Amino acid sequence: VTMSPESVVAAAGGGNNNSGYNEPQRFALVVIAVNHNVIRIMNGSMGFPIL
Amino acid sequence: IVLRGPTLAPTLDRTATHTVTRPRALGSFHSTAGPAKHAASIMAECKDESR
């Protein structure tokens, strides 16, 4: 991923009043994944056939 | 009169005719598989303290 000039200038503080970036800012990258799975129900119980 | 080697221009053949563009060969190298399996949990039907 590539940052932005706005991000690199808001990382440092120095913003005026009611600017949001008055203090130095910290950022964290987060990634989420959505996948598939199979559930088997038998013998009055459950388990993963492939795990 | 001037005599010299006659100029002969080759002909025939075919250029840029019926483009096909099918050179790809399928196949690649990566991991093999995963040896994972699970059972159907554990059932529990016991009470009354039958010794």
Short mmCIF file of N, CA and C in Angstrom, two decimals:
data_model
loop_
_atom_site.label_atom_id
_atom_site.label_comp_id
_atom_site.label_asym_id
_atom_site.label_seq_id
_atom_site.Cartn_x
_atom_site.Cartn_y
_atom_site.Cartn_z
N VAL A 1 0.85 -1.18 0.00
CA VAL A 1 0.00 0.00 0.00
C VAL A 1 0.88 1.24 0.00
N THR A 2 0.36 2.31 -0.58
CA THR A 2 1.08 3.58 -0.69
C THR A 2 0.30 4.65 0.06
N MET A 3 1.01 5.43 0.88
CA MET A 3 0.40 6.49 1.66
C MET A 3 0.11 7.69 0.76
N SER A 4 -0.30 8.79 1.36
CA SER A 4 -0.68 10.00 0.64
C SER A 4 0.05 11.20 1.22
N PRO A 5 0.25 12.25 0.43
CA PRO A 5 0.86 13.47 0.99
C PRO A 5 0.06 14.06 2.14
N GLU A 6 -1.27 13.96 2.08
CA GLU A 6 -2.08 14.40 3.21
C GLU A 6 -1.76 13.59 4.46
N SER A 7 -1.59 12.28 4.31
CA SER A 7 -1.23 11.45 5.46
C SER A 7 0.15 11.81 6.00
N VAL A 8 1.13 12.01 5.11
CA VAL A 8 2.48 12.29 5.58
C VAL A 8 2.60 13.69 6.16
N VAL A 9 1.69 14.60 5.81
CA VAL A 9 1.72 15.93 6.42
C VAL A 9 0.87 15.99 7.69
N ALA A 10 -0.14 15.13 7.81
CA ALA A 10 -0.91 15.05 9.04
C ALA A 10 -0.26 14.18 10.10
N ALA A 11 0.73 13.36 9.72
CA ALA A 11 1.46 12.58 10.71
C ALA A 11 2.16 13.50 11.71
N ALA A 12 2.76 14.58 11.23
CA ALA A 12 3.31 15.59 12.11
C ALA A 12 2.21 16.52 12.61
N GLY A 13 2.46 17.13 13.77
CA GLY A 13 1.50 18.04 14.35
C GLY A 13 1.54 19.42 13.72
N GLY A 14 1.41 20.46 14.54
CA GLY A 14 1.48 21.82 14.05
C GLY A 14 0.20 22.38 13.49
N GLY A 15 -0.88 21.60 13.47
CA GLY A 15 -2.14 22.12 12.97
C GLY A 15 -2.71 23.19 13.89
N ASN A 16 -3.49 24.09 13.30
CA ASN A 16 -4.09 25.18 14.05
C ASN A 16 -5.29 24.65 14.84
N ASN A 17 -6.03 25.56 15.47
CA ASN A 17 -7.17 25.16 16.29
C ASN A 17 -8.27 24.55 15.43
N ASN A 18 -8.93 23.53 15.98
CA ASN A 18 -10.03 22.83 15.30
C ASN A 18 -9.59 22.30 13.93
N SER A 19 -8.38 21.76 13.87
CA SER A 19 -7.86 21.16 12.65
C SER A 19 -7.79 19.65 12.69
N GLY A 20 -7.87 19.04 13.88
CA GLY A 20 -7.82 17.60 13.99
C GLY A 20 -6.41 17.06 14.10
N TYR A 21 -5.51 17.55 13.25
CA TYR A 21 -4.11 17.12 13.24
C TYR A 21 -3.21 18.09 14.00
N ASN A 22 -3.73 18.73 15.05
CA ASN A 22 -2.91 19.60 15.87
C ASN A 22 -1.77 18.82 16.52
N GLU A 23 -2.06 17.64 17.03
CA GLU A 23 -1.07 16.74 17.60
C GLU A 23 -0.61 15.73 16.56
N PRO A 24 0.58 15.16 16.74
CA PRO A 24 1.04 14.12 15.80
C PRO A 24 0.07 12.95 15.77
N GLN A 25 -0.10 12.37 14.59
CA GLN A 25 -1.11 11.35 14.35
C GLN A 25 -0.46 10.00 14.06
N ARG A 26 -1.09 8.94 14.55
CA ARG A 26 -0.63 7.57 14.37
C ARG A 26 -1.68 6.77 13.63
N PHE A 27 -1.23 5.90 12.73
CA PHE A 27 -2.12 5.12 11.89
C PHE A 27 -1.76 3.64 11.96
N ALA A 28 -2.78 2.80 11.81
CA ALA A 28 -2.58 1.35 11.80
C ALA A 28 -3.35 0.73 10.64
N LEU A 29 -2.69 -0.15 9.91
CA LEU A 29 -3.28 -0.86 8.79
C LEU A 29 -3.90 -2.15 9.29
N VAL A 30 -5.15 -2.41 8.87
CA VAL A 30 -5.89 -3.60 9.27
C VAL A 30 -6.51 -4.24 8.03
N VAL A 31 -6.42 -5.57 7.96
CA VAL A 31 -6.92 -6.36 6.84
C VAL A 31 -7.78 -7.48 7.40
N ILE A 32 -8.94 -7.70 6.77
CA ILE A 32 -9.88 -8.74 7.15
C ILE A 32 -10.13 -9.63 5.93
N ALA A 33 -10.31 -10.92 6.18
CA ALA A 33 -10.56 -11.89 5.12
C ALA A 33 -11.86 -12.64 5.39
N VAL A 34 -12.60 -12.92 4.32
CA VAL A 34 -13.82 -13.71 4.38
C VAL A 34 -13.65 -14.92 3.48
N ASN A 35 -13.85 -16.12 4.05
CA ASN A 35 -13.60 -17.37 3.35
C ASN A 35 -14.77 -18.35 3.52
N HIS A 36 -14.57 -19.59 3.10
CA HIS A 36 -15.59 -20.63 3.16
C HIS A 36 -15.13 -21.78 4.04
N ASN A 37 -16.10 -22.54 4.55
CA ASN A 37 -15.82 -23.73 5.35
C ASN A 37 -17.01 -24.67 5.27
N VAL A 38 -16.78 -25.92 5.68
CA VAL A 38 -17.79 -26.97 5.63
C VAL A 38 -17.95 -27.56 7.02
N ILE A 39 -19.20 -27.69 7.48
CA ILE A 39 -19.52 -28.25 8.78
C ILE A 39 -20.36 -29.51 8.57
N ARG A 40 -20.00 -30.58 9.27
CA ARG A 40 -20.70 -31.86 9.18
C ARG A 40 -21.40 -32.15 10.50
N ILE A 41 -22.67 -32.53 10.43
CA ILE A 41 -23.48 -32.85 11.60
C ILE A 41 -23.84 -34.33 11.53
N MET A 42 -23.45 -35.09 12.55
CA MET A 42 -23.77 -36.51 12.60
C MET A 42 -23.61 -37.01 14.02
N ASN A 43 -24.32 -38.10 14.33
CA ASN A 43 -24.25 -38.76 15.64
C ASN A 43 -24.55 -37.79 16.77
N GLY A 44 -25.48 -36.87 16.53
CA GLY A 44 -25.82 -35.87 17.53
C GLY A 44 -24.66 -34.98 17.93
N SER A 45 -23.78 -34.67 16.98
CA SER A 45 -22.60 -33.86 17.27
C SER A 45 -22.13 -33.22 15.97
N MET A 46 -21.05 -32.44 16.07
CA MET A 46 -20.53 -31.69 14.94
C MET A 46 -19.01 -31.84 14.88
N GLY A 47 -18.47 -31.63 13.68
CA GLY A 47 -17.04 -31.70 13.48
C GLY A 47 -16.67 -31.14 12.13
N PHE A 48 -15.36 -30.94 11.94
CA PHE A 48 -14.83 -30.42 10.69
C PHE A 48 -14.30 -31.57 9.86
N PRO A 49 -14.89 -31.87 8.70
CA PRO A 49 -14.39 -32.99 7.89
C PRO A 49 -13.06 -32.71 7.22
N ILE A 50 -12.66 -31.45 7.06
CA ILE A 50 -11.42 -31.11 6.39
C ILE A 50 -10.51 -30.36 7.35
N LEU A 51 -11.11 -29.66 8.31
CA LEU A 51 -10.38 -28.86 9.29
C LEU A 51 -9.48 -27.84 8.60
N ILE B 1 24.71 -1.22 -74.88
CA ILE B 1 23.70 -1.03 -73.85
C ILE B 1 24.15 -1.66 -72.54
N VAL B 2 23.70 -1.06 -71.43
CA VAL B 2 24.15 -1.49 -70.11
C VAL B 2 23.63 -2.88 -69.80
N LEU B 3 24.50 -3.73 -69.26
CA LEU B 3 24.15 -5.07 -68.82
C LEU B 3 24.50 -5.22 -67.35
N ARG B 4 23.58 -5.79 -66.58
CA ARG B 4 23.77 -5.98 -65.15
C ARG B 4 22.83 -7.07 -64.68
N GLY B 5 23.09 -7.57 -63.47
CA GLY B 5 22.26 -8.58 -62.87
C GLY B 5 20.84 -8.10 -62.67
N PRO B 6 19.88 -8.79 -63.27
CA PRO B 6 18.47 -8.39 -63.12
C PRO B 6 18.03 -8.46 -61.66
N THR B 7 17.18 -7.51 -61.28
CA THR B 7 16.68 -7.45 -59.91
C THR B 7 15.39 -8.27 -59.81
N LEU B 8 15.41 -9.30 -58.98
CA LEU B 8 14.26 -10.17 -58.77
C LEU B 8 13.76 -9.98 -57.34
N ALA B 9 12.47 -9.68 -57.20
CA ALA B 9 11.87 -9.45 -55.90
C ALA B 9 11.11 -10.69 -55.46
N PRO B 10 11.51 -11.34 -54.36
CA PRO B 10 10.73 -12.48 -53.86
C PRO B 10 9.32 -12.06 -53.48
N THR B 11 8.39 -13.00 -53.62
CA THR B 11 6.97 -12.73 -53.45
C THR B 11 6.39 -13.90 -52.66
N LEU B 12 5.07 -14.06 -52.69
CA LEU B 12 4.34 -15.11 -51.98
C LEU B 12 4.35 -14.86 -50.48
N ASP B 13 4.32 -15.93 -49.69
CA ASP B 13 4.27 -15.86 -48.23
C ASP B 13 3.02 -15.13 -47.75
N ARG B 14 2.92 -14.90 -46.44
CA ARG B 14 1.77 -14.22 -45.87
C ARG B 14 2.18 -13.58 -44.56
N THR B 15 1.89 -12.29 -44.40
CA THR B 15 2.25 -11.53 -43.21
C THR B 15 1.00 -10.96 -42.56
N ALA B 16 0.92 -11.11 -41.24
CA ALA B 16 -0.19 -10.60 -40.43
C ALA B 16 -1.53 -11.11 -40.95
N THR B 17 -1.66 -12.44 -40.94
CA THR B 17 -2.86 -13.11 -41.43
C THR B 17 -3.37 -14.06 -40.37
N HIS B 18 -4.63 -13.88 -39.96
CA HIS B 18 -5.33 -14.80 -39.06
C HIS B 18 -4.57 -14.99 -37.75
N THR B 19 -4.47 -13.89 -37.01
CA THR B 19 -3.81 -13.92 -35.71
C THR B 19 -4.52 -14.89 -34.78
N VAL B 20 -3.75 -15.76 -34.13
CA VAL B 20 -4.28 -16.78 -33.23
C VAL B 20 -3.97 -16.45 -31.77
N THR B 21 -2.68 -16.31 -31.44
CA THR B 21 -2.22 -15.92 -30.10
C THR B 21 -2.74 -16.89 -29.04
N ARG B 22 -2.26 -18.13 -29.15
CA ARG B 22 -2.52 -19.17 -28.15
C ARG B 22 -1.22 -19.88 -27.77
N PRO B 23 -0.28 -19.18 -27.15
CA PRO B 23 0.98 -19.81 -26.73
C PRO B 23 1.03 -20.25 -25.27
N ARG B 24 0.01 -19.96 -24.47
CA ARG B 24 0.07 -20.21 -23.04
C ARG B 24 0.03 -21.71 -22.74
N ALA B 25 0.79 -22.11 -21.73
CA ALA B 25 0.80 -23.49 -21.24
C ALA B 25 0.47 -23.46 -19.76
N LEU B 26 -0.59 -24.16 -19.38
CA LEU B 26 -1.05 -24.15 -17.99
C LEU B 26 -0.16 -25.03 -17.12
N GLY B 27 -0.06 -24.67 -15.85
CA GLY B 27 0.74 -25.39 -14.89
C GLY B 27 1.57 -24.45 -14.04
N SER B 28 1.77 -24.83 -12.78
CA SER B 28 2.54 -24.02 -11.85
C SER B 28 3.00 -24.90 -10.69
N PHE B 29 3.81 -24.32 -9.81
CA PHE B 29 4.36 -25.03 -8.67
C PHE B 29 4.02 -24.28 -7.39
N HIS B 30 3.44 -24.99 -6.43
CA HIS B 30 3.10 -24.44 -5.12
C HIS B 30 2.99 -25.59 -4.13
N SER B 31 2.39 -25.32 -2.98
CA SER B 31 2.24 -26.33 -1.94
C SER B 31 1.38 -27.49 -2.43
N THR B 32 1.50 -28.63 -1.76
CA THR B 32 0.86 -29.86 -2.22
C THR B 32 -0.56 -30.00 -1.68
N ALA B 33 -0.71 -30.08 -0.36
CA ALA B 33 -2.01 -30.29 0.28
C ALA B 33 -1.84 -30.05 1.77
N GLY B 34 -2.90 -30.33 2.53
CA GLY B 34 -2.87 -30.19 3.97
C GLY B 34 -3.50 -31.37 4.67
N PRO B 35 -2.72 -32.03 5.54
CA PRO B 35 -3.22 -33.21 6.28
C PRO B 35 -3.93 -32.86 7.59
N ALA B 36 -5.19 -32.46 7.46
CA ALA B 36 -6.00 -32.06 8.60
C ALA B 36 -7.33 -32.81 8.60
N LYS B 37 -7.77 -33.22 9.78
CA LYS B 37 -9.05 -33.89 9.94
C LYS B 37 -9.49 -33.74 11.39
N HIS B 38 -10.79 -33.94 11.62
CA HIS B 38 -11.36 -33.83 12.95
C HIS B 38 -12.44 -34.88 13.13
N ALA B 39 -12.70 -35.22 14.39
CA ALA B 39 -13.73 -36.18 14.75
C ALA B 39 -15.03 -35.45 15.09
N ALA B 40 -16.06 -36.22 15.43
CA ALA B 40 -17.37 -35.66 15.75
C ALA B 40 -17.51 -35.37 17.24
N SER B 41 -16.55 -34.64 17.79
CA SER B 41 -16.54 -34.20 19.19
C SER B 41 -16.68 -35.42 20.10
N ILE B 42 -17.25 -35.23 21.28
CA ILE B 42 -17.44 -36.30 22.26
C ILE B 42 -18.85 -36.20 22.83
N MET B 43 -19.56 -37.32 22.84
CA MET B 43 -20.90 -37.38 23.42
C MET B 43 -20.83 -37.78 24.88
N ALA B 44 -21.84 -37.36 25.65
CA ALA B 44 -21.89 -37.62 27.09
C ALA B 44 -23.34 -37.84 27.50
N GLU B 45 -23.68 -39.09 27.80
CA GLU B 45 -25.01 -39.46 28.30
C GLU B 45 -24.80 -40.34 29.52
N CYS B 46 -24.67 -39.72 30.69
CA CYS B 46 -24.46 -40.48 31.92
C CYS B 46 -24.95 -39.66 33.10
N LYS B 47 -25.66 -40.32 34.01
CA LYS B 47 -26.18 -39.71 35.23
C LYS B 47 -26.61 -40.84 36.16
N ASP B 48 -27.25 -40.48 37.27
CA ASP B 48 -27.82 -41.37 38.28
C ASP B 48 -26.77 -42.15 39.06
N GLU B 49 -25.48 -41.99 38.75
CA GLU B 49 -24.39 -42.65 39.47
C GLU B 49 -24.61 -44.16 39.55
N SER B 50 -24.62 -44.79 38.38
CA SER B 50 -24.82 -46.24 38.31
C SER B 50 -23.51 -46.97 38.58
N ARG B 51 -22.88 -46.67 39.71
CA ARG B 51 -21.62 -47.30 40.12
C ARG B 51 -20.54 -47.17 39.05
#
